[PDB]
Design an enzyme around this catalytic site. Structure first.
Site, PDB file in Angstrom:
ATOM      1  N   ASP A  69       0.868  -1.173   0.000  1.00  0.00           N
ATOM      2  CA  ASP A  69       0.000   0.000   0.000  1.00  0.00           C
ATOM      3  C   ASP A  69       0.904   1.223   0.000  1.00  0.00           C
ATOM      4  O   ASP A  69       1.518   1.536   1.024  1.00  0.00           O
ATOM      5  CB  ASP A  69      -0.895   0.020   1.236  1.00  0.00           C
ATOM      6  CG  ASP A  69      -1.938  -1.093   1.241  1.00  0.00           C
ATOM      7  OD1 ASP A  69      -1.722  -2.097   0.545  1.00  0.00           O
ATOM      8  OD2 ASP A  69      -2.962  -0.952   1.950  1.00  0.00           O
TER       9      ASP A  69
ATOM     10  N   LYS B  94      -7.089   3.326  -2.095  1.00  0.00           N
ATOM     11  CA  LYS B  94      -7.304   3.222  -0.653  1.00  0.00           C
ATOM     12  C   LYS B  94      -7.522   4.625  -0.106  1.00  0.00           C
ATOM     13  O   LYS B  94      -6.869   5.570  -0.562  1.00  0.00           O
ATOM     14  CB  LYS B  94      -6.089   2.533   0.027  1.00  0.00           C
ATOM     15  CG  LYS B  94      -6.063   2.473   1.557  1.00  0.00           C
ATOM     16  CD  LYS B  94      -4.912   1.586   2.018  1.00  0.00           C
ATOM     17  CE  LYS B  94      -4.655   1.722   3.530  1.00  0.00           C
ATOM     18  NZ  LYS B  94      -3.380   1.074   3.988  1.00  0.00           N
TER      19      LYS B  94
ATOM     20  N   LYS C 137     -10.157   0.073  -1.130  1.00  0.00           N
ATOM     21  CA  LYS C 137      -9.937  -0.303   0.265  1.00  0.00           C
ATOM     22  C   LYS C 137     -10.347   0.860   1.155  1.00  0.00           C
ATOM     23  O   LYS C 137      -9.872   1.984   0.969  1.00  0.00           O
ATOM     24  CB  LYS C 137      -8.488  -0.706   0.510  1.00  0.00           C
ATOM     25  CG  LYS C 137      -8.170  -1.034   1.975  1.00  0.00           C
ATOM     26  CD  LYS C 137      -6.787  -1.597   2.071  1.00  0.00           C
ATOM     27  CE  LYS C 137      -6.308  -1.785   3.480  1.00  0.00           C
ATOM     28  NZ  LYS C 137      -4.903  -2.275   3.506  1.00  0.00           N
TER      29      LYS C 137
END
Lengths: 220, 220
Positions: free
Chosen positions: A88, A151, A180
């Site tokens: 990430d 995300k 996400k």
């Protein structure tokens, strides 16, 4: 089956190996999709999760996103060598604010090319710092550079996931990338609200409380 | 000369190119020791400051210190290639809290060796998260690994410079390393108290207000 949507996360700077090991133990007990830890713990987490279906996820250029694309790429290669199978990364927020979309895209691409398919790549846009237009543009640049997920949040800025942001990012990426939801997802009701708005992964430290629907132990 | 003790600092993740150019313009005006910016801005800062005695300083593994020594070393080499001549690294806090002192030392050493005389190395111990025993141990490790400074705080994880901490770190490193007081130092009286306690460099976003005592531009 929500367990397979949970990235069981511990990223505080003072986290110790004992805490990381307990994190991994919980992930194995509950069948979480992944643990998410800082790069220093990747090897450790991989050792605890070997021979299981729990993946090691780490964070890249995190939480500020203000390092160079070359450093983010190196950190990604290093992490994969150490055992990570998802990363990430944090977008270059200042570049995005400065209008340097070319650099934003090149920075995401540096991480994706470093992974070379060996790790899933999620791009944290840091919704708390962006306008809606900037959230949309960040998602489009992420998809253009071959990222796998967008995300919402690092958990280290002024705000976390909202259902409005989740839905906006989902509408932007379509079926070309996952979404996400992260930051402030501390209970099953919030997790379900985010999944309903369009999230396919939840980044959280409260995954045990989420999967037991609140009827677990240490749900406090 | 208080100006030449000030590292004039901008590290917010949303900082833009115009804000970095402004920071450099201020540092040239007042002759600060350095600007301190995130690695993505090093080249920009080096362009703006080249030909002056204001150094470009950046931050390594910042703010969490939880990446690997190899990544910290690459980021240091990369920053020096982009124009940095001082680096402020964050110690591996969690490894220290876990008692992995050999890793804390090797982590500092990788950055020292990557710099190899080309850049000054400051080690942020992040006093807010440490016990006094940990503060002392961290400074001793920083000196053992060959660092040039120890630094109190990142400004991102919960607490900043105190006269007690500055004094303790100065007592611990003695004359073998500098002490940089950073975090919450935004007025001249506080800077004075930190220098009195043993600091030889000041990390601050408010260098103009400190050096002018208050007569500086837009002091609000």
């Amino acid at each position: 089956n929500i367990a397979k949507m949970i990235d069981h996360t511990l990223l505080k700077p003072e986290a110790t190996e004992q805490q990381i090991v307990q994190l991994c133990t919980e992930a194995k007990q509950y069948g979480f999709a992944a643990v998410c830890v800082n790069p220093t713990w990747v090897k450790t987490a991989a050792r605890e999760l070997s021979g299981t279906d729990v993946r090691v996820c780490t964070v890249i250029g995190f939480p500020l996103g203000a390092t160079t694309p070359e450093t983010k790429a190196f950190e990604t290669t290093n992490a994969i060598e150490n055992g990570a199978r998802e990363v990430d990364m944090v977008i270059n927020i200042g570049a995005l604010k400065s209008g340097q979309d070319e650099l934003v895209e090149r920075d995401i691409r540096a991480v994706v090319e470093a992974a070379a398919g060996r790790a899933l790549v999620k791009v944290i846009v840091e919704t708390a710092l962006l306008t809606d237009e900037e959230k949309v543009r960040a998602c489009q640049l992420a998809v253009k550079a071959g990222a796998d997920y967008v995300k919402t949040s690092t958990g280290f800025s002024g705000g976390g996931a909202t259902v409005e942001d989740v839905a906006l990012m989902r509408k932007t990426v379509g079926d070309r990338a996952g979404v996400k939801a992260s930051g402030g997802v501390r209970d099953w009701k919030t997790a379900e609200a985010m999944i309903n708005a369009g999230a396919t992964r939840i980044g959280t430290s409260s995954g045990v409380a989420i999967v037991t629907g609140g009827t677990g132990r240490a749900d406090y």
